[PDB]
From a paper:
Recombinant human ASM expressed from Chinese hamster ovary (CHO) cells is being developed as enzyme replacement therapy (ERT) for the non-neurological manifestations of ASMD, and is currently in the phase 1/2 pediatric trial and phase 2/3 trial for adults. The recombinant human ASM being developed for ERT, olipudase alfa, was also crystallized without any protease in the crystallization drops. Olipudase alfa was expressed in CHO cells with complex glycans. The olipudase alfa crystals diffracted to around 4 Å at synchrotron, and clear glycosylation and zinc cofactors densities were observed. Its refined structure was essentially identical to ASM from HEK cells. Clear electron density allowed us to build all residues from W84 to M611 as well as two zinc ions, six N-linked glycans, and eight disulfides. The same residue range is visible in the olipudase alfa structure, suggesting ASM N and C termini are inherently disordered and flexible.
ASMD is a result of mutations in acid sphingomyelinase (ASM, E.C. 3.1.4.12), which hydrolyzes sphingomyelin to ceramide and phosphocholine. The structure includes an N-terminal saposin domain (residues 84–167), a proline-rich linker (168–195), a catalytic metallophosphatase domain (196–538), and a helical C-terminal domain (539–611). The substrate binding cleft in ASM is created by the catalytic domain in the middle, and saposin domain and C-terminal domain at two opposite sides. Zinc ions are prerequisites for activity of both forms.
Numbering used by the authors: 84 to 611
């Protein structure tokens, strides 16, 4: 008989579940997994072993509770009649029934108006074990560190301040960055959008991550003193990397250890109501100025690499619904909003990104600026209206990384923003990027000099940095190879790759600038 397949299917996966709770079976999962890691030469055997032992516990639990959960698996295999497969299913948040007011671009600031200067720091990736002179091109995923061994005598080891390879930054190079901020300042606030630990992801204890948090935190408080700093949660803060279980998972394997430690390390910067949200799901809002709301989002809940979302991808932590509430409240008060976060919205899971896109379109008048990092390169994302995908209505600045990883100059970013006064638009007016030219900083017996790399309005001839100016820049760059090469140069913080970026490469790079929503090829219909 056939009437027995559904009972048998569930019986199988219920026992599947119970089998995978026993630690010696988890180890057995790891043992074969390490041997396959070695057969496909994914990495040196030592890291294969480390990374699987680190990942196996959380990973087997996630699979047990999702793909192999009887309701899901028998849904996939046997159809809606037996269970219900809903892994990464589509979902929608609710916009309030308040009418969307008429679209209104920001007013040009009056002459002599207050300008707010914001320092933007992202992707610091301090590698505690960075070791000068070690091999920059080792067989591991991160080199120039303890255990990378020595290079051949034909090439030189890692520069004292960094290296142009898959290498991160020694703490002293981070110290130099903060020490040299004087010329670029003074600053009204700092936005600090994540990635404190290095890319040593095969051996990262909770203590290694907290030391990184605690150490780098203390360093910026030492150099910025009274200047408020607003962090956002990066994907490398936790362990395993990208492992951010949503608050519906409680216990030791939750993110309590990370968010609680952040709340105590960041107490001097964030108010009390904000520390509440931070402890729950690593996001928060506060008011830097009267008339301005800042919202710090945790992009790991949108992230394609957060394997916990296999259990439930629907608006994790209710963060998007919470964001709607705050934006409406801001609209009701006539406030403007800054959003900061780590992973840029265009790189999120499809459903999350589409709801965020819709949220941005709805509150285009209230959102004044958007800031992300994570990509380590200097770029941006343009938002358009939902109705026609052709009227530019927002832009996200993707600031480049402090880390070299990979092959880049260290860099950081400063914004001029319509300042602190009643009626301010609070939009970005211009920005500047500073870099450390490693080819001359690494000269023996040299003292690093952080130099201004460029100023946005000056080099791109922009009349402002409103969304329409950046839309225009992308389409200008489509037809002006010299201008695109400038963008390509700055994209890599002054150290572009040797291989020329030709026609296909250019189109893909330009396309990325317009793709603020994931899996939406239509946004690039005018390029290809
Ligand atoms: C919570 O779970 C973590 C694993 O994620 C446990 O951490 C390990 O503790 C041993 C004990 O010496 C260390 O050798 C490992 O390196 C630790 N792993 C990590 C990733 O930090 C931790 O002990 C657990 N805590 C409780 C209270 O159960
Ligand atoms: C994943 O969690 C979300 C909520 O975070 C669940 O969506 C809820 O489902 C219940 C039961 O039908 C409803 O009463 C709630 O109103 C829903 N909330 C939202 C925001 O949609 C979802 O069902 C969960 N998925 C799984 C597989 O457990
Ligand atoms: C959902 C389903 O398959 N139900 C079947 C039913 O159609 C059939 O009449 C009965 C007797 O053979 O066995 C069972
Ligand atoms: C950071 C900063 O300058 N904040 C000021 C605030 O102290 C002052 O009360 C307000 C009204 O002028 O303007 C703004
Ligand atoms: C080692 C190296 O690349 N040196 C270059 C040099 O060739 C060039 O003339 C100069 C000005 O652009 O910049 C630097
Ligand atoms: C969400 O809205 C879209 C319309 O864009 C619709 O296709 C989808 O079925 C909706 N999902 C839910 C759960 O309402
Ligand atoms: C960095 O310095 C080297 C050495 O003088 C120079 O060739 C290169 O053009 C410089 N690049 C930048 C972006 O400063
Ligand atoms: Zn990142
Ligand atoms: Zn990074």
């Amino acid at each position: 008989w056939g009437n027995l397949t559904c009972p048998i299917c569930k019986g199988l996966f219920t026992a599947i579940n119970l089998g995978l709770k026993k630690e010696p079976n988890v180890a057995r999962v790891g043992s074969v997994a390490i041997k396959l890691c070695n057969l496909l030469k994914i990495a040196p055997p030592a890291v294969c072993q480390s990374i699987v032992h680190l990942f196996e516990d959380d990973m087997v639990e996630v699979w047990r509770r999702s793909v192999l959960s009887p309701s899901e698996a028998c849904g996939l295999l046997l159809g809606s009649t037996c269970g219900h497969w809903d892994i990464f299913s589509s979902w929608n948040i609710s916009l309030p029934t308040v009418p969307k007011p008429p679209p209104k671009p920001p007013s040009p600031p009056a002459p002599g108006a207050p300008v707010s200067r914001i320092l933007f720091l992202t992707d610091l990736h301090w590698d505690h074990d960075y070791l000068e002179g070690t091999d920059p091109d080792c067989a591991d995923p991160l080199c120039c560190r303890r255990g990378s061994g020595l290079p051949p005598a034909s090439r030189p080891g890692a520069g004292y301040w960094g290296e142009y390879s898959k290498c991160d930054l020694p703490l002293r190079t981070l110290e130099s960055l903060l020490s040299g901020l004087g010329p670029a300042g003074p600053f009204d606030m700092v936005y600090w959008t994540g990635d404190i630990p290095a890319h040593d992801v095969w051996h990262q204890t909770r203590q290694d991550q907290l030391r990184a948090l605690t150490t780098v935190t203390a360093l910026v408080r030492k150099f910025l003193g009274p200047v408020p700093v607003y962090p956002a949660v990066g994907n490398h803060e936790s362990t395993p990397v990208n492992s951010f279980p949503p608050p519906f998972i409680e216990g030791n394997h939750s993110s309590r250890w990370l968010y609680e430690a952040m709340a105590k390390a960041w107490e001097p910067w964030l108010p009390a109501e904000a520390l509440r949200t931070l402890r729950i799901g690593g996001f928060y809002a506060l008011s830097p100025y009267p008339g301005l709301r800042l919202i710090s989002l945790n992009m790991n809940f949108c992230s394609r690499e957060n394997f916990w979302l296999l259990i439930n991808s629907t608006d994790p932590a209710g963060q998007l619904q919470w964001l709607v509430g705050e934006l409406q409240a801001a609209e009701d008060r006539g406030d403007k909003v800054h959003i900061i976060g780590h992973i840029p919205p265009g790189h999120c899971l499809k459903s999350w990104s589409w709801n965020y896109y819709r949220i941005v379109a709805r509150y285009e008048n209230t959102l004044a600026a958007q800031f992300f990092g994570h990509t380590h390169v200097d770029e941006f994302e343009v938002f358009y209206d939902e109705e026609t995908l052709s009227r530019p209505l927002a832009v996200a600045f993707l600031a480049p990384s402090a880390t070299t990883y990979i092959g880049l100059n260290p860099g950081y970013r400063v914004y001029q923003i319509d300042g602190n006064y009643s009626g301010s638009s609070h939009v970005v007016l211009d920005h500047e990027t500073y870099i450390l030219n490693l080819t001359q900083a690494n000269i023996p017996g040299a003292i690093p000099h952080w130099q201004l790399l460029y100023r946005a309005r000056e080099t791109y001839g922009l009349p402002n940095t409103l969304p329409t100016a950046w839309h225009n820049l992308v389409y200008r760059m489509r037809g002006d190879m010299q201008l695109f090469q400038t963008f390509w140069f700055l994209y890599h913080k002054g150290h572009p790759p040797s291989e020329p970026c030709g026609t296909p490469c250019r189109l893909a790079t330009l396309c990325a600038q317009l793709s603020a929503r994931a899996d939406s090829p239509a946004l690039c219909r005018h390029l290809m």
